[PDB]
Amino acid sequence: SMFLPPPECPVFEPSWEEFADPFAFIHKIRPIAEQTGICKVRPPPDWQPPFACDVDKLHFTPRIQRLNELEAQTRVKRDYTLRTFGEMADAFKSDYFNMPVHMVPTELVEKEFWRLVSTIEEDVTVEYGADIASKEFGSGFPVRDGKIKLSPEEEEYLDSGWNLNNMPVMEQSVLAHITADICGMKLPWLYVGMCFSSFCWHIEDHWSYSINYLHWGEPKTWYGVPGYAAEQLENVMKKLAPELFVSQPDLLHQLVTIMNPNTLMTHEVPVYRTNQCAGEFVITFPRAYHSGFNQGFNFAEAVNFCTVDWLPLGRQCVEHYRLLHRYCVFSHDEMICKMASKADVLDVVVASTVQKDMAIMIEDEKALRETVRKLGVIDSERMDFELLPDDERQCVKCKTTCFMSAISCSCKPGLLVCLHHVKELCSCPPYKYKLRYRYTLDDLYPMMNALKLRAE
Numbered sequence: 001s002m003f004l005p006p007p008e009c010p011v012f013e014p015s016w017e018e019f020a021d022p023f024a025f026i027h028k029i030r031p032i033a034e035q036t037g038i039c040k041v042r043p044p045p046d047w048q049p050p051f052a053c054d055v056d057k058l059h060f061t062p063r064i065q066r067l068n069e070l071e072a073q074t075r076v077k078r079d080y081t082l083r084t085f086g087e088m089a090d091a092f093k094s095d096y097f098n099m100p101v102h103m104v105p106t107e108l109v110e111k112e113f114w115r116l117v118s119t120i121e122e123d124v125t126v127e128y129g130a131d132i133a134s135k136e137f138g139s140g141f142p143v144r145d146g147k148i149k150l151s152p153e154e155e156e157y158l159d160s161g162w163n164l165n166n167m168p169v170m171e172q173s174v175l176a177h178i179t180a181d182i183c184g185m186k187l188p189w190l191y192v193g194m195c196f197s198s199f200c201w202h203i204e205d206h207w208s209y210s211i212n213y214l215h216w217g218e219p220k221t222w223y224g225v226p227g228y229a230a231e232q233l234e235n236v237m238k239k240l241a242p243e244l245f246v247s248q249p250d251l252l253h254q255l256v257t258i259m260n261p262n263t264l265m266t267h268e269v270p271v272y273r274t275n276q277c278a279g280e281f282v283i284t285f286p287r288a289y290h291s292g293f294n295q296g297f298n299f300a301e302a303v304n305f306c307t308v309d310w311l312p313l314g315r316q317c318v319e320h321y322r323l324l325h326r327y328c329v330f331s332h333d334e335m336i337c338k339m340a341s342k343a344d345v346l347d348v349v350v351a352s353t354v355q356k357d358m359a360i361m362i363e364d365e366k367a368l369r370e371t372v373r374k375l376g377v378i379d380s381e382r383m384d385f386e387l388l389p390d391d392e393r394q395c396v397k398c399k400t401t402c403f404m405s406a407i408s409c410s411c412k413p414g415l416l417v418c419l420h421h422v423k424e425l426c427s428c429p430p431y432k433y434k435l436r437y438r439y440t441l442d443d444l445y446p447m448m449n450a451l452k453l454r455a456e
């Protein structure tokens with residue numbers, strides 16, 4: 001056999017009552033769906049957000065993609081309109097199979113994708129569209145304030161919990177009250193697909209959820225691995241493609257690849273599949289590896305998503321980043337402290353969950369400060385870390401974005417290390433160093449206490 005399709009991931013068909021609140025729904029399905037990494041959600045049949053777009057006025061520049069298994073691709077890096085892209089895309093698939101596009105079976109495209117990527121003699125290239133929601137490339141969902149009168153049907157979906165523009169700013173999102181420069185994680189991204197255009201194996205930034213909606217067009221085929229098996233997958237991948245695991249100079253140089261799910265399955269990594277059709281959602285859970293390809297010309301929209309369930313995994317993720325020397329998108333501790341400073345307006349369940357994470361943060365910080373004092377760092381000064389651009393507050397050694405504290409030395413102006421890397425700053429003795437801290441321990445306990453009062 002060439003390709004043995006992985007088993008199907010779970011599919012949910014919520015009632016209107018179940019669907020109305022996405023956070024409740026996603027919490028409810030977690031015990032099932034976290035075991036598979038991905039799941040598919042079919043909205044109720046009358047949930048039909050209208051899509052409108054001028055195919056001649058929307059412009060984008062897609063990336064050329066070689067389709068070679070295990071070959072390195074960079075995670076981010078010729079102008080088309082949506083019309084001219086669609087014409088290219090349709091002609092490509094039509095010519096590839098010598099058939100009309102709807103007649104090409106999904107099973108065949110999948111088999112052929114996996115043949116094509118493993119065959120060295122084949123050098124098939126396609127074009128992959130990825131674009132932030134913006135003035136120049138709008139969301140597929142309705143949004144306010146475009147200097148345009150919206151239809152009543154459009155207005156029905158402005159405030160939907162499953163309008164991907166709203167999910168990050170709803171009260172149950174833990175990023176709802178955050179306002180650091182992290183646009184990539186509260187704003188949707190648009191993906192214009194064609195036959196075989198592919199998303200390599202990856203997990204989301206900070207191990208966040210993702211929500212993915214296929215607005216229209218031909219299906220999107222997915223493979224997913226549960227969070228629990230993330231390190232098994234990485235070990236399998238490292239053995240077969242070690243070049244992908246060399247550390248990156250920055251966060252725009254991440255290496256990813258196409259890899260046959262049968263290889264993962266041969267090494268006892270659990271993998272699930274689905275074909276996502278127009279009008280369906282795919283949800284990826286924290287640290288759930290996923291990859292896939294498009295069956296044909298299509299239009300998808302996705303957003304990162306951080307719930308109360310995610311919060312403690314977010315802390316683990318930043319620890320894992322420190323161990324790997326990987327750059328952070330934002331400071332998790334900064335997020336926690338921001339939320340604490342708004343305790344009175346938080347959702348009560350969010351308040352309760354932030355309180356728990358904050359207690360861990362404070363105890364770890366207490367221990368770290370005791371440790372650096374014993375190393376002979378004596379001098380200290382308060383510092384408003386949040387005011388520094390990220391690249392001015394990264395640990396020299398592990399690249400973590402500092403917030404709670406860091407160590408500086410006047411012999412190396414502007415350099416910082418986190419409290420795990422006091423020995424990596426410079427050759428001067430520790431009495432010349434200064435502990436730079438955002439809060440005293442006595443500042444922190446009342447912040448956590450406000451959260452407790454809000455939580456009731």
Ligand SMILES: CCN(CCN(C)C)C(=O)CNCc1cc(C(N)=O)ccn1
Nearest residue numbers: 076184189191199210212300302303304
């Ligand atoms: C939430 C959107 N986002 C942030 C974008 N930035 C990293 C640039 C992602 O990474 C999503 N992960 C990539 C991806 C693509 C696709 C696709 N082309 O259908 C499906 C699943 N995952």
Ligand SMILES: [Mn+2]
Nearest residue numbers: 067116119122
């Ligand atoms: Mn090939």
Ligand SMILES: [Mn+2]
Nearest residue numbers: 202204210290
């Ligand atoms: Mn993704």
Ligand SMILES: [Mn+2]
Nearest residue numbers: 380381382383
């Ligand atoms: Mn001062």
Ligand SMILES: [Zn+2]
Nearest residue numbers: 395398418421
């Ligand atoms: Zn460090």
Ligand SMILES: [Zn+2]
Nearest residue numbers: 409411426428
């Ligand atoms: Zn020094």
